[PDB]
Design a protein around this ligand. Sequence first.
Ligand code: CLA
Ligand code: CLA
Ligand code: CLA
Ligand code: BCR
Lengths: 165, 153, 160, 169, 125
Amino acid sequence: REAPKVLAGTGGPLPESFWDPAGFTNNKTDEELLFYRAAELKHGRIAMAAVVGWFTNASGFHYLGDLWLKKPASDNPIEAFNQLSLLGVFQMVFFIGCLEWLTTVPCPPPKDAPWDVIGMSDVLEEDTDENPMAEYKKIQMQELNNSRLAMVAIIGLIVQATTTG
Amino acid sequence: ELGVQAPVGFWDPVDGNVASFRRRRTVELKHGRISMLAAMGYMTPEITGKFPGYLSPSTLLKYDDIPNGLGAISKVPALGWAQIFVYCGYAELSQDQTPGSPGAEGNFGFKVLTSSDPDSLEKKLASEIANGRLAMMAFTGMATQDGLTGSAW
Amino acid sequence: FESELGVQAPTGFWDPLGFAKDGSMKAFKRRRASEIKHGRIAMLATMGYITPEITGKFPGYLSPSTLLKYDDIPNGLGAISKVPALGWAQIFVYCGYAELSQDQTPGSPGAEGNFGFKVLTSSDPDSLEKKLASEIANGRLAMMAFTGMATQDGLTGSAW
Amino acid sequence: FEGELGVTPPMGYFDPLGLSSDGDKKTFIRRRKSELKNGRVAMWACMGWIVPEWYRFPGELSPSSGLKFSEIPNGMAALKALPTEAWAQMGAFVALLELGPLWQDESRAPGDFKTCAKYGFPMGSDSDPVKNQYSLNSEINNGRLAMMAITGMVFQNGITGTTGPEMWA
Amino acid sequence: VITLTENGLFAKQFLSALAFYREGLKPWQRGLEIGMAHGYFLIGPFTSLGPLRNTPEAATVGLLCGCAIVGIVSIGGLIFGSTIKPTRFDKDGDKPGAGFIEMINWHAVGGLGGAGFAHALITVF
Ligand code: CLA
Ligand code: CLA
Ligand code: CLA
Ligand SMILES: CC1=C(/C=C/C(C)=C/C=C/C(C)=C/C=C/C=C(C)/C=C/C=C(C)/C=C/C2=C(C)CCCC2(C)C)C(C)(C)CCC1
């Protein structure tokens, strides 16, 4: 594999199965593969929060949005987005814009691990041999596998909502 | 080698290489498998009837209400054929041709060839591809029959 | 870059807006891959309108469950709402693979418009540039023809 | 700092009050970036007062308010007549420009942005100050002219109380 | 003892990029930035839920109270700079604590500016 070894033992059904049934990674360089993972984790981390946000909003808990609209917004998260006051949406975009600015320009993640937006690499070990720790690779699997599931899950929610209610 | 047959040679009046033939071989075997599944698959809603039944999504106790060779739909089993389409993709993305080192070898999960009866190479590999070619024409000819010449039988 | 397949003859290195004063060497191939892909789609798109006009609509049923004789679907804009979303999904899926096939990633053989069709592979008789330049030039014509055709079908109302 | 891109024959090296007598190369870089950016904002602002006095955009600013581009007053009265959500979204967009594309890199030229072209055309080029010394000076002087004008037009609206013929005698 | 919230890469780069720590900032720039933040924020707690929260003005009162808070904390900073005299902002060969005093004065100016800007936004919009 050579370059895909930098993201090795971190995907597939079982943790050490480089899936890629399209050749999207072969012939690509090490930095490109790392950047591809940075896109994957960022999508998945947002997808995990997106699914959680979808469920806490599709059950009837839209306080900020019921207290701002002065009426219980519809449970359907897609329809509740329209009812949500335009001031709320613009502030929501701005807050994420500040976070995206903050991570990129002032506090950039490293170039070898472009997904360390919190930056554990300066205090983490990741290469020791203890059992009651050094399971960081396993928790990387749980983040990726859960996030990948959340990505297809949230799309299913949006596609079904926008079509078959 | 492999699918070279007996009644004809390389039958290439048009690939004719190594790497390009390998990809074409994967297409050939793949199309062969589906036709054989489809050909025997089409004869079964015939004699032995539209065998199905049991509690299905919007098709509970559906006796395979998708009739005719095309299957039609109208929320009858053919909508459930999309589940066949989806799960067909799962096998097409897990046990696929990108890690399929030979032409169309899936590592023989069933191990039918581990002396259960099939054999490696020789006639069996040639018999699989030759039978696939016959079924592909048969399935296409069966498609013409349902369209403008009545039904299958 | 001033010596690729795009410079035919009637116009030279036609970059009035200066995308090449800063166009990186890989950016050319990326934009060339965009141009080749755009042109090939336009040729297929154009055929897809002029051919159902002279040749009648498909003898068939399109959707075996929702009575689409291909005649209730007009040739032009508005057919997007007439063709089923699944027939739309299935063409989306088919085009989805055609790029999720052998990769067109930067630097890959799919990134310069090469995919493995080889319908017209002349035995290198100083014609590889001819077929390449013809495909690019026709794609440029097809894109311009389509946009006019799209405006023809829209501003008039239907077809041409 | 004579020879820096901003010296013009009408004044040479102006500096009347002597605000940059000492080197303070950091101070000059900051003030030049302000001079260019304030000029560009003023230039876009100066066109923002002239054009509505001739032409108004066709559609509606806020379709779910009845509000159409025509009935919005011109000048420093649209701030209290254009809905607050409208103005907040311009602020959010200018925030994107200041933080994202139009982010002045330290190593780059004073006014150089890593996503904009030779006169600002979106989708860009790295600056070539020596070759473009004419237009770089032209931008500053036009920005310098615009800053005087936009300070005028706003002042004219503040006193006259409109944007019509009286505001610009 | 290094922890994630103080010694991680993000935490270190966030603390270093604060106005109080950002490299290359003149002391008046740090003061101006901190003051703008404080003055803009401090208006809210008074103009809302204040003694005159329901009056027709209800915001000029908040503006005055926020400016008063900014002035009081600036006076406290001046006391700190004239008693402790931090010398981490002084340039070489200057009166000790001059950088801190300049930062505090420009914090007062920035607090006035931020309070006025918040009030202007509230009144206009
Ligand atoms: C934002 C999407 C995204 C991105 C950028 C990545 C990126 C990556 N994945 Mg990944 N993955 C994702 C989503 C994503 N993933 C989801 C949702 C799943 C669940 C099925 C997986 C499951 C998965 C496995 C099981 C494995 C990877 C692996 C990898 C790495 C190898 C590169 C690769 O596979 O192609 C990178 C490029 C892409 C993924 C392109 C995105 C997809 C294109 C645009 C077409 C898809 C369009 C789609 C058909 C239509 C959208 C709707 C759809 C939901 C129906 C790379 C870091 C491998 C790895 O690192 O293991 C060591 C691996 O084994 N992924
Ligand atoms: C998916 C279809 C498919 C594919 C990919 C292949 C691929 C291959 N076949 Mg094969 N074959 C097929 C179907 C297919 N076959 C069928 C159905 C038959 C039965 C008639 C045969 C009979 C056959 C023989 C007897 C031999 C091969 C051989 C080969 C190999 C070399 C031949 C070659 O280069 O052909 C290249 C051909 C093409 C690129 C054209 C593709 C077909 C076009 C698109 C249409 C053909 C006309 C069709 C009937 C009209 C359809 C109408 C429709 C639109 C409605 C290659 C691996 C030879 C071999 O073993 O080599 C080692 C050999 O001797 N094949
Ligand atoms: C998707 C469209 C597209 C793209 C990506 C390209 C890309 C390319 N072309 Mg090209 N071309 C196109 C369409 C396109 N072309 C069309 C339609 C024509 C026919 C007029 C041509 C004619 C042409 C010639 C004659 C030559 C090129 C060349 C080139 C290459 C270098 C020039 C360059 O950077 O162009 C970049 C192109 C773009 C960035 C496209 C931007 C288009 C703008 C945004 C809009 C233009 C107006 C548009 C028609 C408005 C439509 C109205 C609508 C809104 C209603 C590059 C690979 C040259 C070459 O190969 O050099 C080696 C060369 O000699 N092209
Ligand atoms: C809640 C939240 C949070 C927090 C946040 C924050 C903390 C915010 C803040 C904010 C702020 C705090 C803001 C501020 C701003 C400010 C401003 C914006 C200002 C401005 C100013 C100005 C502009 C001024 C000017 C001037 C001067 C300088 C002087 C003279 C006068 C004048 C006026 C000209 C977190 C993340 C934790 C999480 C969750 C969410």
